[PDB]
Amino acid sequence: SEQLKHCNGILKELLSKKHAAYAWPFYKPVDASALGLHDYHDIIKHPMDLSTVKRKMENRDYRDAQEFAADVRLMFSNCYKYNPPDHDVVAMARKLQDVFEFRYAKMPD
Ligand SMILES: CC(=O)N1c2ccc(-c3ccc(C(=O)O)cc3)cc2[C@H](Nc2ccc(Cl)cc2)C[C@@H]1C
């Protein structure tokens, strides 16, 4: 769980105010009704968000670092899948993923 402690640190950073400018769309599940998005749940079969990830870390539902990484990347992929390349939210996901991947890359073994 030493690797997972470092994952928990990474999660904290993603959720900190420092990255709030581009992280906010990912705090919570996409609410398709509230946003008026009729086709979202058809196009995206495995929704993911930072709250779910946080919950799974807290309940210790991750077996390892790479399970955590798959969830974080799923979240970014859903966003890239669903939205157009020029959409602000795509620019925002890329900024956050930059933080994620760099930190994740800097984990020990
Ligand atoms: C993740 C993803 O791809 N999407 C997503 C998810 C959640 C929210 C969202 C979340 C919170 C609020 C709010 O609290 O007001 C509003 C919209 C918005 C979006 C995206 N919409 C959006 C994002 C950024 C900007 Cl600057 C303008 C529009 C679309 C997409 C479904």
Side-chain angles (χ1 to χ4, degrees), residues 37-65:
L37 295 178
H38 310 295
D39 60 351
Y40 186 87
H41 286 293
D42 303 307
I43 286 165
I44 295 311
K45 289 285 182 279
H46 301 281
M48 188 48 61
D49 65 282
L50 288 177
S51 276
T52 301
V53 177
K54 193 188 149 190
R55 238 157 36 236
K56 294 173 77 181
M57 190 72 63
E58 283 165 3
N59 300 156
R60 305 165 209 228
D61 291 317
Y62 289 112
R63 290 185 187 273
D64 58 9

Short mmCIF file of all heavy atoms in Angstrom, two decimals, residues 37-65:
data_model
loop_
_atom_site.label_atom_id
_atom_site.label_comp_id
_atom_site.label_asym_id
_atom_site.label_seq_id
_atom_site.Cartn_x
_atom_site.Cartn_y
_atom_site.Cartn_z
N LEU A 37 -27.73 16.39 -21.75
CA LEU A 37 -26.96 15.53 -22.66
C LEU A 37 -27.63 14.18 -22.83
O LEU A 37 -27.39 13.25 -22.05
CB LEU A 37 -25.53 15.33 -22.15
CG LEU A 37 -24.66 16.58 -22.11
CD1 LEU A 37 -23.30 16.20 -21.54
CD2 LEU A 37 -24.52 17.19 -23.50
N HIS A 38 -28.42 14.06 -23.89
CA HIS A 38 -29.28 12.90 -24.08
C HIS A 38 -28.54 11.64 -24.45
O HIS A 38 -29.01 10.56 -24.14
CB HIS A 38 -30.37 13.22 -25.12
CG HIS A 38 -31.11 14.51 -24.84
ND1 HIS A 38 -31.88 14.67 -23.74
CD2 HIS A 38 -31.14 15.72 -25.53
CE1 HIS A 38 -32.39 15.92 -23.74
NE2 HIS A 38 -31.94 16.56 -24.84
N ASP A 39 -27.38 11.78 -25.08
CA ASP A 39 -26.64 10.62 -25.61
C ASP A 39 -25.42 10.17 -24.79
O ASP A 39 -24.72 9.25 -25.19
CB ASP A 39 -26.20 10.89 -27.06
CG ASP A 39 -25.28 12.10 -27.19
OD1 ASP A 39 -25.11 12.84 -26.19
OD2 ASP A 39 -24.74 12.33 -28.29
N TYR A 40 -25.17 10.82 -23.65
CA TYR A 40 -23.92 10.60 -22.92
C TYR A 40 -23.75 9.16 -22.48
O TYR A 40 -22.73 8.55 -22.75
CB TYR A 40 -23.81 11.53 -21.70
CG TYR A 40 -22.46 11.43 -21.01
CD1 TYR A 40 -21.39 12.21 -21.43
CD2 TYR A 40 -22.25 10.53 -19.98
CE1 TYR A 40 -20.15 12.12 -20.82
CE2 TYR A 40 -21.01 10.42 -19.37
CZ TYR A 40 -19.96 11.21 -19.79
OH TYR A 40 -18.73 11.10 -19.20
N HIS A 41 -24.77 8.62 -21.83
CA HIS A 41 -24.71 7.28 -21.27
C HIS A 41 -24.76 6.19 -22.29
O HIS A 41 -24.53 5.03 -21.95
CB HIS A 41 -25.79 7.10 -20.21
CG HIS A 41 -25.47 7.83 -18.93
ND1 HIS A 41 -24.44 7.46 -18.14
CD2 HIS A 41 -26.03 8.96 -18.35
CE1 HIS A 41 -24.36 8.31 -17.10
NE2 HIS A 41 -25.34 9.22 -17.23
N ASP A 42 -25.06 6.55 -23.54
CA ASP A 42 -24.96 5.63 -24.66
C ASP A 42 -23.52 5.59 -25.15
O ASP A 42 -22.97 4.53 -25.38
CB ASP A 42 -25.90 6.04 -25.80
CG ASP A 42 -27.36 6.15 -25.35
OD1 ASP A 42 -27.91 5.18 -24.77
OD2 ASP A 42 -27.98 7.22 -25.60
N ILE A 43 -22.92 6.77 -25.29
CA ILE A 43 -21.55 6.87 -25.78
C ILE A 43 -20.53 6.43 -24.74
O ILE A 43 -19.51 5.85 -25.08
CB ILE A 43 -21.25 8.29 -26.30
CG1 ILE A 43 -21.97 8.50 -27.65
CG2 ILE A 43 -19.75 8.52 -26.45
CD1 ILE A 43 -22.07 9.94 -28.11
N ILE A 44 -20.82 6.70 -23.46
CA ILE A 44 -19.91 6.36 -22.36
C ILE A 44 -20.52 5.27 -21.51
O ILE A 44 -21.54 5.47 -20.86
CB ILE A 44 -19.60 7.60 -21.49
CG1 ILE A 44 -18.82 8.65 -22.30
CG2 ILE A 44 -18.82 7.21 -20.23
CD1 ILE A 44 -17.64 8.10 -23.08
N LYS A 45 -19.87 4.11 -21.49
CA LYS A 45 -20.41 2.95 -20.79
C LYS A 45 -19.88 2.81 -19.38
O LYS A 45 -20.50 2.12 -18.57
CB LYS A 45 -20.12 1.67 -21.58
CG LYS A 45 -20.93 1.53 -22.86
CD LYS A 45 -22.37 1.15 -22.57
CE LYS A 45 -23.18 0.96 -23.85
NZ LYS A 45 -23.65 2.25 -24.41
N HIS A 46 -18.72 3.42 -19.10
CA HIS A 46 -18.07 3.31 -17.78
C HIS A 46 -17.67 4.66 -17.26
O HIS A 46 -16.49 5.03 -17.31
CB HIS A 46 -16.85 2.41 -17.84
CG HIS A 46 -17.17 1.02 -18.30
ND1 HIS A 46 -17.71 0.11 -17.48
CD2 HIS A 46 -17.06 0.42 -19.55
CE1 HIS A 46 -17.91 -1.04 -18.16
NE2 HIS A 46 -17.51 -0.84 -19.43
N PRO A 47 -18.66 5.42 -16.73
CA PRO A 47 -18.41 6.77 -16.24
C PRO A 47 -17.45 6.75 -15.09
O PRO A 47 -17.46 5.82 -14.31
CB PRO A 47 -19.79 7.24 -15.74
CG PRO A 47 -20.78 6.29 -16.33
CD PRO A 47 -20.05 5.00 -16.50
N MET A 48 -16.62 7.78 -14.97
CA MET A 48 -15.70 7.88 -13.84
C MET A 48 -15.53 9.34 -13.45
O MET A 48 -15.70 10.23 -14.26
CB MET A 48 -14.37 7.22 -14.17
CG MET A 48 -13.40 7.09 -13.00
SD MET A 48 -14.09 6.41 -11.49
CE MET A 48 -14.64 4.78 -12.00
N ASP A 49 -15.25 9.56 -12.17
CA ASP A 49 -15.06 10.89 -11.65
C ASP A 49 -14.21 10.84 -10.39
O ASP A 49 -14.06 9.77 -9.77
CB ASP A 49 -16.41 11.53 -11.32
CG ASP A 49 -17.12 10.82 -10.20
OD1 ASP A 49 -17.71 9.73 -10.45
OD2 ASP A 49 -17.08 11.35 -9.06
N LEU A 50 -13.70 12.00 -10.01
CA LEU A 50 -12.76 12.10 -8.91
C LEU A 50 -13.35 11.71 -7.54
O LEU A 50 -12.64 11.22 -6.67
CB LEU A 50 -12.14 13.50 -8.88
CG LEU A 50 -11.15 13.75 -10.02
CD1 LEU A 50 -10.65 15.18 -9.96
CD2 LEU A 50 -9.98 12.77 -9.94
N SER A 51 -14.64 11.92 -7.37
CA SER A 51 -15.32 11.52 -6.15
C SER A 51 -15.38 10.02 -6.03
O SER A 51 -15.26 9.46 -4.95
CB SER A 51 -16.75 12.07 -6.11
OG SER A 51 -16.74 13.39 -5.62
N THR A 52 -15.59 9.35 -7.15
CA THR A 52 -15.67 7.89 -7.11
C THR A 52 -14.31 7.35 -6.74
O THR A 52 -14.20 6.54 -5.84
CB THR A 52 -16.20 7.35 -8.44
OG1 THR A 52 -17.50 7.93 -8.65
CG2 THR A 52 -16.25 5.79 -8.47
N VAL A 53 -13.28 7.85 -7.42
CA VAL A 53 -11.90 7.48 -7.13
C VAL A 53 -11.56 7.71 -5.65
O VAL A 53 -10.99 6.83 -5.00
CB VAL A 53 -10.91 8.24 -8.05
CG1 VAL A 53 -9.45 7.92 -7.69
CG2 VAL A 53 -11.20 7.90 -9.51
N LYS A 54 -11.94 8.86 -5.11
CA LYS A 54 -11.69 9.18 -3.70
C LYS A 54 -12.33 8.17 -2.76
O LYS A 54 -11.71 7.70 -1.80
CB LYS A 54 -12.22 10.58 -3.37
CG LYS A 54 -11.74 11.12 -2.03
CD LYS A 54 -12.44 12.41 -1.64
CE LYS A 54 -12.58 12.56 -0.12
NZ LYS A 54 -13.46 13.68 0.32
N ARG A 55 -13.60 7.86 -3.05
CA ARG A 55 -14.37 6.88 -2.29
C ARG A 55 -13.68 5.52 -2.32
O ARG A 55 -13.52 4.88 -1.29
CB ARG A 55 -15.81 6.77 -2.84
CG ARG A 55 -16.89 7.07 -1.82
CD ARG A 55 -18.23 7.50 -2.43
NE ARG A 55 -18.52 6.80 -3.68
CZ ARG A 55 -18.77 7.38 -4.85
NH1 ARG A 55 -18.80 8.71 -4.98
NH2 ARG A 55 -19.01 6.62 -5.93
N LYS A 56 -13.27 5.08 -3.51
CA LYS A 56 -12.62 3.77 -3.66
C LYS A 56 -11.28 3.71 -2.91
O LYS A 56 -10.92 2.68 -2.37
CB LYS A 56 -12.44 3.40 -5.14
CG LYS A 56 -13.76 3.17 -5.88
CD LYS A 56 -13.59 2.97 -7.38
CE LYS A 56 -13.08 1.57 -7.69
NZ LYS A 56 -12.87 1.31 -9.12
N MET A 57 -10.55 4.82 -2.88
CA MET A 57 -9.33 4.89 -2.11
C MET A 57 -9.65 4.83 -0.64
O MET A 57 -8.95 4.15 0.10
CB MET A 57 -8.55 6.19 -2.38
CG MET A 57 -7.15 6.18 -1.77
SD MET A 57 -6.03 5.06 -2.65
CE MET A 57 -5.98 5.83 -4.28
N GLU A 58 -10.68 5.55 -0.21
CA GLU A 58 -11.03 5.56 1.20
C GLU A 58 -11.52 4.21 1.67
O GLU A 58 -11.11 3.73 2.72
CB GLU A 58 -12.02 6.66 1.50
CG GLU A 58 -11.32 7.99 1.55
CD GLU A 58 -12.24 9.18 1.49
OE1 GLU A 58 -13.49 9.00 1.47
OE2 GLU A 58 -11.68 10.30 1.47
N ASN A 59 -12.35 3.57 0.86
CA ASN A 59 -12.79 2.21 1.20
C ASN A 59 -11.74 1.13 0.92
O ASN A 59 -12.01 -0.05 1.10
CB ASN A 59 -14.08 1.90 0.46
CG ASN A 59 -15.19 2.85 0.81
OD1 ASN A 59 -16.12 3.03 0.03
ND2 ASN A 59 -15.10 3.48 1.97
N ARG A 60 -10.56 1.54 0.46
CA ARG A 60 -9.49 0.62 0.12
C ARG A 60 -9.97 -0.43 -0.86
O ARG A 60 -9.79 -1.60 -0.64
CB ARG A 60 -8.92 -0.04 1.38
CG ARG A 60 -8.45 0.95 2.44
CD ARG A 60 -8.24 0.24 3.78
NE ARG A 60 -8.46 1.11 4.96
CZ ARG A 60 -7.64 1.21 6.01
NH1 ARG A 60 -6.51 0.52 6.09
NH2 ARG A 60 -7.97 2.03 7.01
N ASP A 61 -10.57 0.00 -1.97
CA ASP A 61 -11.05 -0.89 -3.03
C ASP A 61 -10.03 -1.05 -4.17
O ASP A 61 -10.25 -1.83 -5.07
CB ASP A 61 -12.39 -0.39 -3.59
CG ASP A 61 -13.55 -0.50 -2.58
OD1 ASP A 61 -13.67 -1.54 -1.90
OD2 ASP A 61 -14.35 0.44 -2.49
N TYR A 62 -8.92 -0.30 -4.13
CA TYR A 62 -7.85 -0.46 -5.12
C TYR A 62 -6.87 -1.52 -4.66
O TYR A 62 -6.41 -1.48 -3.52
CB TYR A 62 -7.11 0.86 -5.35
CG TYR A 62 -7.94 1.86 -6.10
CD1 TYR A 62 -8.41 3.02 -5.50
CD2 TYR A 62 -8.30 1.62 -7.40
CE1 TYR A 62 -9.21 3.91 -6.20
CE2 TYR A 62 -9.10 2.50 -8.10
CZ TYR A 62 -9.55 3.63 -7.50
OH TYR A 62 -10.34 4.46 -8.23
N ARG A 63 -6.55 -2.48 -5.54
CA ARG A 63 -5.58 -3.53 -5.23
C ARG A 63 -4.17 -2.97 -5.36
O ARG A 63 -3.26 -3.43 -4.68
CB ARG A 63 -5.69 -4.73 -6.18
CG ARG A 63 -6.92 -5.60 -6.04
CD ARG A 63 -6.82 -6.81 -6.96
NE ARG A 63 -8.05 -7.62 -7.01
CZ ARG A 63 -8.36 -8.60 -6.16
NH1 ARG A 63 -7.55 -8.94 -5.16
NH2 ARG A 63 -9.51 -9.26 -6.32
N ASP A 64 -3.99 -2.02 -6.28
CA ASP A 64 -2.66 -1.51 -6.57
C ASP A 64 -2.72 -0.15 -7.30
O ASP A 64 -3.81 0.35 -7.60
CB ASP A 64 -1.85 -2.54 -7.38
CG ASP A 64 -2.54 -2.93 -8.68
OD1 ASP A 64 -3.54 -2.29 -9.07
OD2 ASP A 64 -2.05 -3.89 -9.34
N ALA A 65 -1.55 0.42 -7.56
CA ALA A 65 -1.40 1.69 -8.23
C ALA A 65 -2.04 1.68 -9.60
O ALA A 65 -2.71 2.64 -9.99
CB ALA A 65 0.06 2.04 -8.35
#
